[PDB]
Design a protein around this ligand. Structure first.
Ligand code: PX4
Ligand code: PX4
Ligand code: PX4
Ligand code: PX4
Ligand code: PX4
Ligand code: PX4
Ligand code: PX4
Ligand code: PX4
Ligand code: PX4
Ligand code: PX4
Ligand code: CPS
Ligand code: CPS
Ligand code: CPS
Ligand code: CPS
Lengths: 242, 242, 242, 242
């Protein structure tokens, strides 16, 4: 039994195997770039379509193998779960009146992140910030929800494209947060009917802007506070212990 | 006497009471989201209106109770003052030719910030920066006031929508500070009549931008200077005292 | 002789004198805000005009006095030089076919910065950064000059409003640096004639953006490097000297 | 032999030589600014054209000399390589149906950066950050490539100006990253046909924005972590060694 199992485990945990997979990702990447062109597709079109159907069958083996080799531990791995879903997507057939999935196929190129350790590290690094930010995101989202409800009620009847709905207002308030056209595009028009509308949007811009800056400052200053704690230990320990 | 008073104080300072209040906030939140839809309002409309009239009577008890339990100390509490005003708003009746207040009702969902300690902390944290910034805000506001007066006098007669008034110019100068359409929307048009107008707006953009960046840098560098002072004490004390 | 001189020096260096001056600044401030309105000017117009002619004569005494009291040292003072020029401006009479100066009158409200120590400190603080930035500004300005010359030569004949002139191109390149309408407003139009124009503007946006961010980072990291040097001294001196 | 070689090496490594070169750069700079004007070119036009043909012959000597003096070491020098190419450009004759190069002539003013040590230092300083950023740029570029392919496939048939091509989509996605017109100009139009398009662009804006901020924070916090390591050594060494 454990004779057969290790036969595959030595294959899977192989460096070659990894490298081979990575080789395909890059190739199926270059492939999917060229499929973008209907010129290319009119000549070398069909070659590409089978290469796609190959790579995807190969990748399905890969995952089955990875699962057999890792069993439970695989579904406990964020990176493997990703690889499952991003290949699973590529399995569900175009046929069934949902041409959208034919467009998501290309998420399988994210496997290159999943398969290359220095990419993995970066992603892990970026993500590591988020869980501290969760409450602040929640507060900001509540803030949006309140203001979105208020604007729907104040401006939605005269300005329904922008505020007719909680979603329209959620969308407009995000545009205002990015400051895209907020004045020329949105508020200057609102004021033609609601002259005091600036009393809603300037303070919204102040709060939302102030928060994002403070978040950044908090992150930097709080992180530098830890590095200073860590110094105190090692500087004070070599003063005490010596 | 102090028999009856403590009967309520044990209720109010109850965890259950807090949790119950919080439960309503979330529900009256979800409620006010659905009121946004006239579809929903045409079916389940009236259920919602009474739930609103209940929650608001309940919340008025809550505050009366909170006041009896806390007396003076309550009106010395920013968080309670908020809760008073944000519920008071919700009391003043729609009737009296001011439909605006019907739209402010929803500020009562900010109680969720007021009622949940980790939200409270964040808000306290964000606000803690402001009092150091006060003079700089004052300087910036003076700067706006001077430039707003100057632009009203230079451009207001040909460009009254944007500069006819001190307020129009205050509003335009804030749009320029955010850089929304400043060139295409405002300055490029001004130059068609006042070719040297760029001499007003580029330097305004330099000053205002430079200041906001410097403020951020000052905050970070000045905060890291304190954390280094605090280290000196503990590092130097364990060198001296030992 | 030095009997008479000190008679005035005790007046000038008076706290009252300072406070009186500051009192006028605020009042002549509020005044110049109300002059903004032709409604107000049609009623209380003339009161205002004489108050202006008073304040300005008073301020001219002030400066003469300040000069007599300080002699050479006055013209060596940036803050006094400012006060000289910002009041001098207000002296040159509207008459002489230059209505622009009537609009600069209001720069005299900057005296409030000049006259209030906590404002003075802020301004001094903001300015303290600039001299380190001088070379980098020079580099950036050279960069603009080169790119402005290149764009005038590439795009100015088809796009003269935006690039016909070194100044037009200098102005457009600053708009691109702020990212105002850079694509929709400028580059997307250029591409209709010069399809590879993106090869000029994306890299311009990368360089200019990268530099401004790096400048900020350099300032923060370099400033935190000094505060760490200063610690080393005091931490190492109390280790050696004790 | 080494008699003749040193005759030139003393010339080239001369301070005067450097200063002379720098003098021309500034002059040929001022020159190329004035060539921008067809007024000036109609009067003093030809003077300028020969001055240009002189400066460029002189600069070609300079480089030949620099090469003879430095041999191999020259082509190992980024700054000299630059000087070679930026002067080489200026050699290839306008004639050959490529009027574009007549516009690149002016890159030779970048020699002033190359020739002035404090400029050199800045450029070296800015560049010093990039190699750490390489992987993150690669990740971001992969991200753009995936999203550009997806948008070409989702929106390119109805919105070909913006998404018809991988390049059009690459270009649009960069405009969205800068947030120029992203909503009013791009997404609001897309939604008229593809109402859920916001599900593509908001998350694209979140990822891309989050990353750029994190990069800046990482740089600052990671750099301050090194300066704290360096302190530990010198603070702990003067505790141990003394
Ligand atoms: C998201 O799920 C949360 C996880 C957190 O797991 P994490 O603890 O980061 O990973 C395991 C431990 N580590 C970092 C040392 C390898 O996140 C991860 O670390 C796993 C990431 C899962 C998604 C795969 C990434 C898709 C590519 C998207 C990158 C585009 C950004 C430009
Ligand atoms: C410090 C960190 C800063 C981040 C804090 C900001 C939080 C707010 C996020 C704003 C993004 C919302 C975008 C948005 O409004 O999308 C629309 C959706 C769906 O409603 P709706 O728009 O009617 O559906 C599509 C129809 N159309 C054409 C009118 C748009 O609108 C909705 O109804 C729901 C929106 C999603 C919920 C928000 C959760 C985001 C967590 C991140
Ligand atoms: C800290 C947590 C904060 C979380 C906040 C995130 C919530 C985001 C919800 C986004 C709303 C999604 C729906 C949307 O945008 O569309 C508006 C709809 C449509 O109105 P309706 O007129 O029904 O349109 C249907 C089409 N018709 C008329 C032709 C049949 O109108 C509606 O159906 C309104 C939907 C309201 C549902 C509210 C759910 C969120 C509960 C969060 C509670 C916060 C606690 C205080
Ligand atoms: C480092 C921190 C950065 C912050 C410093 C920036 C300070 C300047 C704040 C700019 C915001 C002003 C917004 C603004 O101008 O609003 C208009 C008001 C009212 O005048 P007005 O606009 O005529 O009334 C409405 C009529 N309409 C349609 C023509 C707008 O304009 C006014 O007349 C008064 C404006 C309020 C006073 C400013 C106090 C803000 C403190 C924060
Ligand atoms: C460090 C502190 C700095 C603080 C600065 C903040 C001041 C912000 C004031 C905002 C101005 C609010 C009024 C506004 O924007 O509207 C412009 C008005 C209206 O002109 P008007 O033609 O009267 O319009 C009335 C309508 N009508 C003609 C049909 C009867 O025209 C006016 O009435 C002008 C109002 C001028 C009042 C000035 C009050 C601020 C005093 C601050 C003193 C600073 C010390 C140097
Ligand atoms: C500009 O000229 C350079 C000077 C540098 O002199 P500085 O060494 O800063 O002043 C003397 C010493 N201090 C700081 C301890 C008082 O800069 C100054 O310190 C003097 C400032 C002269 C101009 C007066 C300020 C006008 C108000 C502009 C503020 C608007 C920004 C929002
Ligand atoms: C890290 C720090 C970032 C700062 C670095 C950026 C340096 C570049 C500054 C850009 C600002 C230039 C603004 C600009 O171009 O203004 C126009 C002037 C005058 O030429 P011109 O525009 O023909 O005169 C007015 C006619 N009109 C309607 C076509 C504009 O254009 C000119 O001809 C000369 C422009 C002034 C020289 C630049 C010195 C600025 C030092 C700060
Ligand atoms: C590190 C230092 C960098 C400093 C760079 C800052 C220089 C900024 C200069 C701004 C240019 C100001 C003039 C401007 O923008 O207008 C363009 C003019 C007008 O052309 P034109 O056709 O003569 O128009 C006159 C009107 N007309 C035809 C009806 C008689 O066309 C011209 O006259 C062009 C003016 C060129 C003068 C150049 C002066 C700057 C020398 C900096 C040297 C850098 C060293 C490499
Ligand atoms: C944290 C750091 C942030 C930086 C990360 C961002 C990376 C993405 C860079 C985006 C810039 C791309 C600009 C772009 O799309 O230019 C167009 C080219 C050429 O295709 P195409 O546009 O068809 O050729 C010109 C035709 N026209 C009029 C439709 C534009 O588009 C292409 O086909 C190729 C684009 C160049 C490859 C990207 C490599 C950039 C490395 C930096
Ligand atoms: C971490 C590394 C990431 C690096 C990503 C950077 C790649 C950027 C490539 C930019 C694409 C340049 C071409 C472009 O934008 O134009 C689109 C073309 C033109 O379509 P087409 O219809 O042939 O137009 C020709 C004109 N016609 C029809 C009249 C004869 O359509 C095409 O030809 C599409 C070109 C696809 C080539 C893909 C090359 C990049 C391979 C990167 C592999 C990533 C590994 C996962
Ligand atoms: C302070 C703000 C939120 C406001 C708040 O809650 N203020 C009350 C205290 C929150 C939001 C994101 C949080 C950081 C990130 O998680 C990254 C990192 C993780 C470590 O684990 C601890 C250090 C650090 C720097 C975190 C510190 C702090 O937690 C931050 C700045
Ligand atoms: C320096 C600038 C204003 C310019 C100025 O006044 N410069 C003259 C000195 C002001 C504006 C906001 C101020 C900070 C915040 O308050 C937060 C925090 C509170 C602590 O209590 C002390 C530390 C810290 C970091 C403050 C330091 C400093 O005070 C700041 C940066
Ligand atoms: C590093 C960059 C320019 C690039 C460069 O020149 N890099 C070669 C080294 C320049 C531009 C502005 C300069 C700062 C400001 O002056 C403020 C302050 C003044 C003190 O006096 C010394 C510290 C500090 C933080 C300065 C450090 C450094 O000088 C900076 C960051
Ligand atoms: C952390 C991020 C990338 C994300 C990542 O890879 N996270 C896994 C660990 C990368 C991108 C750019 C990198 C910096 C620059 O190079 C400048 C400088 C060079 C020194 O040599 C080492 C210090 C420093 C501050 C570098 C630290 C770190 O390397 C950075 C922040």
């Amino acid at each position: 039994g454990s004779h057969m199992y290790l036969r595959i485990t030595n294959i899977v945990e192989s460096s070659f195997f990894t490298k081979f997979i990575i080789y395909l990702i890059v190739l199926n990447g270059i492939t999917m770039g060229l499929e973008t062109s209907k010129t290319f597709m009119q000549s070398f079109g069909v070659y590409t379509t089978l290469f796609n159907q190959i790579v995807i069958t190969i990748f399905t083996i890969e995952i089955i193998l990875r699962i057999y080799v890792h069993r439970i531990s695989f579904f406990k791995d964020p990176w493997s779960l990703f690889d499952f879903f991003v290949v699973a997507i590529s399995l569900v057939p175009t046929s069934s009146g949902f041409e959208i999935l034919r467009c998501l196929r290309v998420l399988r190129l994210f496997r290159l992140v999943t398969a290359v350790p220095q990419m993995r590290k970066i992603v892990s690094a970026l993500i590591s910030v988020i869980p501290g930010m969760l409450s602040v995101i929640a507060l900001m989202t509540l803030f949006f929800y309140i203001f979105a409800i208020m604007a729907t009620c104040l401006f939605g009847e005269r300005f329904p494209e922008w505020f007719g709905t909680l979603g329209e207002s959620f969308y407009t308030l995000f545009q205002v947060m990015t400051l895209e056209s907020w004045s020329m595009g949105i508020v200057r028009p609102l004021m033609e009917v609601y002259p005091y509308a600036w009393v809603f949007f300037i303070p919204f811009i102040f709060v939302v802007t102030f928060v994002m800056i403070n978040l950044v400052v908090a992150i930097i200053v709080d992180a530098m506070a830890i590095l200073n704690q860590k110094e105190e230990q090692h500087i004070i320990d070599e003063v005490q212990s010596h």
